[PDB]
């Protein structure tokens, strides 16, 4: 099964490990060495947590959950029941990850094409991360992890959201929301513009990039331009999740406290702090 | 040093572009601004022309009107003291009328009559403002799906400061204007509902806002791998199909089984957006007026 | 109640609106191929759209899709294997053949037009009032390919004009013809032009352009996917 056009580009070769060994395909998959690897590492992290639902009596997709080692046993190893589990399974996870980016370059380069996709994929892995790996080894427990559970992890949102007070307060989660809010409408756009040139009015002739540029200036005075709008919510989008595992990372070690607090530098800077009225006044 | 597309490398400059014409009115439209090299880095340089009607100016009015009425109010705070102004800019807010004045008008202006009041001017902005994008597309003869995606931001918005609140019987239940203080509404708003991730649809509301940021991440970084190929001209590809597009389709085809389209992906492109404000809407829209609490609901229904 | 069958509503309009999108994804490449090209037996669960036809601008003709697909061009592949899912070697030089990452697809032989009718795509010379507005300008840098050694020189830039951009730079050779190189795949230094993609012995196989105050998107095509085939077949004459 493959796409009309499919084959010409099916040729051998693009491999970083291992030669012609693991290059073909199984259906419309590519293998690749890291195929197999993601394979591995996905089996064994499933197994894994699947076993991890038996010690839990459940198998509810709703209920199962993975929690870290406590706080008690530090970055140190922990029993299986007990948060070992979690433990590998995360180590399977950012195998199965790493493995995937890996396995997306070797596809770049059989199909020549730039590494922009798996580039962009790193900076999810890399938010990933900050949360089971790096906020924990900087906060000395792996218990400062998300668990792995439907709700349960999103149980621990809210609990680590509020353990800082309102956690909109955090300036760089206010950065990084921006991104994310922005992002989907740099989203929204840019579908409804490409579609209502492809998909003009009844009869009409598709319109042109040039209709395109020009119903922006019409609109809002500037156009960003093709090339550019794909730049554009590239950015939008690896920002948005670059200032999201900043907005983590600064949170619990260099700053523990309420972040409305924060703001008060602003308030207290002593060219104002001190003159009467307002709201801080 | 592999070159990646990110910055352009060389930029060039040509007469300043007036735009097709189709059944535009060229008496609306303005000459055209500078050129920013800045910009010219990542996107175009040019500025403008940019095209203002009777609508264009309305719009364009309110929209200032309510950003100075609210502006005023914060002047107001800060004892019109620019030192206070600027240091409490963010914890300043206008507010809405006090429930006992319900859905009436007859709320004072420092009661937040004066709330109403800009908020009457953000309402005659924002839908002469959508007036536009359904305009400037007929104009040039093309579909309106920027017209209906705007919709769907429009309805949040819409349910958020003036469905919700009427369904509630005050004003009091809508969103004051201020930094600081609509950041606290939010997560109040969150609190009285009984913790709002337990809302289905804020649940998928967070699902496409993530999605948005995945799939936008996956199409642009795809374009600029089959830039190479000249992938950004996305509509000459739809007619006739580049290499571009193949290398496109068949990167995920071998990664992820399947594939899009340079039409197609567009489409998942404009939904998965609009699902944010879409669902979220919803949502919110039901809070209060169905479901008081979204953990007892979420014991009784599922 | 009303919530609970509100979202109810919605996982039913959720599972149609994918159905839609993925059906609408299938207007290319589909009905899916076995390797000989006879129509596959496993189609998966999501069938054929009723086709659509757009009109193209400036008397282009139309294009309904879905449609009869056909590559129009010979593939130089063999297989490799002697079943489903493997490597499909080249017969012959896959460069000037055009299979893998050098492939091309047979698009239309005539350059794209602007909102006006005019060709998009126009070397920097005929592009009238059209300057570089900034970087490094590249005419008349040599050119070095990924062997390290001089191509020749950039003797022009071939800009985009509704989207006043760079496209390719036209470099002459030694024997003074000249070729396009897509701007995606050079990088302009202070004292020169590279191309990591091609050595200096492959530039003669750039495919060429008939009209040279012009290109088309089939030879667009053929120089592109040229160019950026030669990262894993130039591979053995590249240094660094
Ligand atoms: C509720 C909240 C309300 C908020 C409103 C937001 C609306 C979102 C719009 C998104 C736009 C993308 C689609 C493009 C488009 O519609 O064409 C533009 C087109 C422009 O007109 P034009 O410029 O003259 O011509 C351009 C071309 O025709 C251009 O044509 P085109 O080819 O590009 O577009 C074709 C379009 C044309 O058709 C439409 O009109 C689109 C309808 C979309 C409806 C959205 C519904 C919202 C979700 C809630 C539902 C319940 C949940 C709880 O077809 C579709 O897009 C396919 C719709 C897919 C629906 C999935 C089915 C699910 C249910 C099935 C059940 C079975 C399952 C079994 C288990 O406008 C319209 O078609 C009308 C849209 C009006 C929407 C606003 C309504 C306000 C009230
Ligand atoms: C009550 C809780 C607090 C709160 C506390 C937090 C906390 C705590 C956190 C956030 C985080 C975020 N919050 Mg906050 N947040 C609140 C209020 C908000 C509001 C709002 C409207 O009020 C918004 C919009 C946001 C938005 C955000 C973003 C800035 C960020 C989520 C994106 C992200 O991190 O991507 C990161 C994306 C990933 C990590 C994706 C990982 C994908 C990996 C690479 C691979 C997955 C593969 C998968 C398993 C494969 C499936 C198999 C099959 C193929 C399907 N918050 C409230 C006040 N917020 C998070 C953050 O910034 O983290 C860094 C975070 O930890
Ligand atoms: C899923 C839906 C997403 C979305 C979609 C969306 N938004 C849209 C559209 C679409 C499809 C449009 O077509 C429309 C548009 O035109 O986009 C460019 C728009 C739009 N989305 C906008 C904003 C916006 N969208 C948001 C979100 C979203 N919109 C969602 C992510 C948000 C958020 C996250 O809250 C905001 C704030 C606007 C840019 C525009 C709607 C324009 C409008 O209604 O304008 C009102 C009228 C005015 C005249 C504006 C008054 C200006 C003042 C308030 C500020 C003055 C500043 C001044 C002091 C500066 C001085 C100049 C300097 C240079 C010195
Ligand atoms: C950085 C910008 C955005 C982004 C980008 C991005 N994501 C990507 C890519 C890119 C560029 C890809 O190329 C890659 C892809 O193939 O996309 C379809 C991908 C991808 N992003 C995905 C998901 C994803 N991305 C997210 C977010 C984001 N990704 C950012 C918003 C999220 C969110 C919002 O949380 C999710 C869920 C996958 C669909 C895919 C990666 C698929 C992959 O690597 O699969 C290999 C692994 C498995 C098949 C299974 C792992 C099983 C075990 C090894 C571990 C168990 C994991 C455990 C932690 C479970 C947790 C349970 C939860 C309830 C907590
Ligand atoms: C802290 C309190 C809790 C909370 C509350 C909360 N979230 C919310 C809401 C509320 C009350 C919404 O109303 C909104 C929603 O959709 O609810 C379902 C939302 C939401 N929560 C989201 C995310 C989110 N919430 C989270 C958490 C929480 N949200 C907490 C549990 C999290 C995480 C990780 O914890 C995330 C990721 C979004 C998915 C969604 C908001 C989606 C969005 O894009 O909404 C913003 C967009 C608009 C309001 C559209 C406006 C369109 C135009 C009318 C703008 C016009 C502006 C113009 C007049 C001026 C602009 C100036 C110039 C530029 C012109
Ligand atoms: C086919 O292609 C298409 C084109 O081309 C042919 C196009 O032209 C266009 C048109 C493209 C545009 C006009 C751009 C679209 C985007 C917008 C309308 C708005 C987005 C604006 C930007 C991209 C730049 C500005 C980005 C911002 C504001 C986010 C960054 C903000 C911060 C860093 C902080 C903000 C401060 C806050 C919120 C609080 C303070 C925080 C403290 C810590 C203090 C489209 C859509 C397109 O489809
Ligand atoms: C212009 O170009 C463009 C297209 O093309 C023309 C595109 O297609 C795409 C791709 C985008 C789409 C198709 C749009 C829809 C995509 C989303 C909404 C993103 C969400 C993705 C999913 C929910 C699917 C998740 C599936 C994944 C990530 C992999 C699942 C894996 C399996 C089912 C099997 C796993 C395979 C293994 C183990 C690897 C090795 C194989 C062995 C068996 C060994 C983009 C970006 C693009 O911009
Ligand atoms: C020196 O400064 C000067 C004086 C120049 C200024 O003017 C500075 C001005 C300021 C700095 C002001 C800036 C204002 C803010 C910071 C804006 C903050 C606002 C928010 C964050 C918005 C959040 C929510 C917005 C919502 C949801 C509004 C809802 C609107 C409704 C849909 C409209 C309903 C209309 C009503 C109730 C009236 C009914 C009448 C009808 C006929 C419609
Ligand atoms: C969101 C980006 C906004 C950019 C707006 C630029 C508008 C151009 C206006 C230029 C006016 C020129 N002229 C001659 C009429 O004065
Ligand atoms: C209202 C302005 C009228 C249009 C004139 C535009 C001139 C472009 C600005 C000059 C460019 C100089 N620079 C440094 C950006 O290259
Ligand atoms: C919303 C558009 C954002 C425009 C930002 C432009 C950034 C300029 C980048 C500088 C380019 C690097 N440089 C000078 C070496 O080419
Ligand atoms: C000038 C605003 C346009 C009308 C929209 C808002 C209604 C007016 C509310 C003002 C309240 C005045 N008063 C006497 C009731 O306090
Ligand atoms: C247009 C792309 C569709 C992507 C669908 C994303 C599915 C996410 C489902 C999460 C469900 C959350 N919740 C609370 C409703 O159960
Ligand atoms: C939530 C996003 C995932 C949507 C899944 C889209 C359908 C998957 C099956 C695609 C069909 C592939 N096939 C066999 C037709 O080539
Ligand atoms: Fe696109
Ligand atoms: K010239």
Not at chain 1, 45 to 56: E, K, N, P, R, Y
Not at chain 2, 232 to 247: N, S
Not at chain 2, 284 to 299: A, E, H, K, P, R
Not at chain 3, 143 to 158: H, M, P, S, T
Request: charged share 15%; net charge neutral.
């Amino acid at each position: 099964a493959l796409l009309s056009f499919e084959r010409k580009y099916r040729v051998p070769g693009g491999t970083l490990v291992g030669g012609n060994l693991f290059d073909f395909w199984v259906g419309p998959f590519y293998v690749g060495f890291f195929g197999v690897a993601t394979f591995f590492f996905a089996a064994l992290g499933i197994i894994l947590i699947a076993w991890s639902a038996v010690l839990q009596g459940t198998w509810n997709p709703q209920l199962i959950s993975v929690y870290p080692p406590a706080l008690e046993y530090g970055l140190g190893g922990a029993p299986l029941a007990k948060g070992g589990l979690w433990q590998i399974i995360t180590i399977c996870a950012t195998g199965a990850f790493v493995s995937w980016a890996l396995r997306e370059v070797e596809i770049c380069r059989k199909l020549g094409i730039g590494y922009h996709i798996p580039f962009a994929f790193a900076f999810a892995i890399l938010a990933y991360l900050t949360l089971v790996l790096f906020r924990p080894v900087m906060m000395g427990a792996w218990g400062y992890a998300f668990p792995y559970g439907i709700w349960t992890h999103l149980d621990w949102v809210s609990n680590t959201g509020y353990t800082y007070g309102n956690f909109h307060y955090n300036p760089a989660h206010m950065i990084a929301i921006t991104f994310f809010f922005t992002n989907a409408l740099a989203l929204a756009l840019h579908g409804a513009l490409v579609l209502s040139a492809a998909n003009p009015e009844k009869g009409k002739e598709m319109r042109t990039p040039d209709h395109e540029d020009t119903f922006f200036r019409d609109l809002v005075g500037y156009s960003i331009g093709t090339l550019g709008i794909h730049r554009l919510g590239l950015l939008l989008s690896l920002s948005a999740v670059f200032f999201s595992a900043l907005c983590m990372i600064i949170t619990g070690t260099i700053w523990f406290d309420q972040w409305v607090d924060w703001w008060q530098w602003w308030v207290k800077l002593p060219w104002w702090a001190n003159i009467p009225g307002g709201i801080n006044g | 040093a592999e070159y990646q597309n990110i910055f352009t490398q060389v930029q060039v400059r040509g007469p300043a572009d007036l735009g097709m014409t189709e059944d535009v009115n060229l008496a609306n439209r303005s000459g055209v601004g500078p050129f920013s090299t800045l910009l010219g880095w990542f996107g175009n340089a040019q500025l403008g022309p940019i095209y203002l009607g009777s609508l264009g100016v309305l719009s364009l009015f309110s929209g200032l009107m309510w950003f100075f009425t609210i502006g005023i109010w914060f002047w107001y705070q800060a004892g019109w003291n620019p030192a206070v102004f600027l240091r409490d800019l963010f914890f300043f807010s206008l507010e809405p009328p006090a429930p006992e004045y319900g859905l009436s008008f007859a709320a004072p202006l420092k009661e937040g009559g004066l709330w109403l009041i800009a908020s009457f001017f953000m309402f005659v902005a924002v839908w002469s403002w959508w007036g536009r994008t359904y305009l400037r597309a007929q104009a040039l003869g093309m579909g309106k799906h920027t017209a209906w995606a705007f919709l769907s931001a429009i309805w949040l918005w819409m349910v958020l400061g003036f469905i919700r609140p009427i369904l509630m019987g005050s004003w009091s239940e809508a969103v004051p204007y201020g930094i600081f203080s609509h950041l606290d509404w939010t997560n109040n708003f969150s609190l009285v509902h009984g913790n709002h991730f337990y809302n289905p649809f804020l649940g998928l509301s967070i699902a496409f806002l993530y999605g948005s940021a995945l799939l936008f991440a996956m199409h642009g970084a795809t374009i600029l791998a089959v830039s190479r190929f000249g992938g950004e001209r996305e509509l000459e590809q739809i007619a006739d199909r580049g290499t571009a597009a193949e290398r496109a389709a068949l990167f995920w085809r071998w990664t992820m089984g399947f594939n899009a389209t340079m039409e197609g992906i567009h489409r998942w492109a404009i939904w998965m957006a609009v699902l944010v404000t879409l669902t979220g809407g919803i949502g919110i829209l039901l809070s209060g007026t169905v479901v008081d609490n979204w953990y007892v609901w979420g014991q009784n229904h599922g | 109640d009303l919530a609970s069958l509100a979202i109810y509503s919605f996982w039913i309009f959720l599972a149609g609106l994918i159905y839609y999108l993925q059906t609408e994804n299938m207007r290319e490449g589909y009905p899916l191929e076995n390797e000989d090209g006879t129509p596959a037996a496993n189609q998966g669960p999501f069938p054929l759209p009723k086709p659509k036809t757009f009109i193209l601008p400036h008397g282009r003709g139309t294009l309904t899709v879905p449609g009869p697909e056909s590559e129009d061009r010979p593939i130089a592949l063999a297989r490799t294997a002697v079943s489903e899912g493997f490597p499909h070697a080249p017969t012959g030089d896959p460069m000037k053949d055009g299979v893998g990452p050098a492939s091309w697809v047979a698009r239309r032989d005539l350059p794209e037009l602007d909102g006006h009718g005019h060709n998009k795509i126009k070397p920097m010379k005929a592009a009238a009032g059209f300057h570089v507005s900034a970087g490094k300008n590249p005419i008349g840098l040599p050119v070095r390919g990924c062997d390290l050694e001089i191509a020749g020189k950039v003797v022009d830039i071939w800009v985009d004009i509704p989207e006043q951009m760079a496209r390719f730079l036209e470099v002459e050779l030694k024997d003074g013809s000249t070729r396009l190189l897509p701007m995606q795949m050079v990088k302009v230094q202070s004292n020169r032009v590279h191309v990591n993609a091609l050595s200096s012995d492959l530039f003669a196989g750039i495919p060429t352009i008939k009209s040279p105050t012009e290109v088309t998107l089939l030879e667009e095509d053929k120089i592109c996917g040229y160019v950026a085939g030669g990262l894993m077949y130039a591979a053995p004459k590249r240094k660094s």
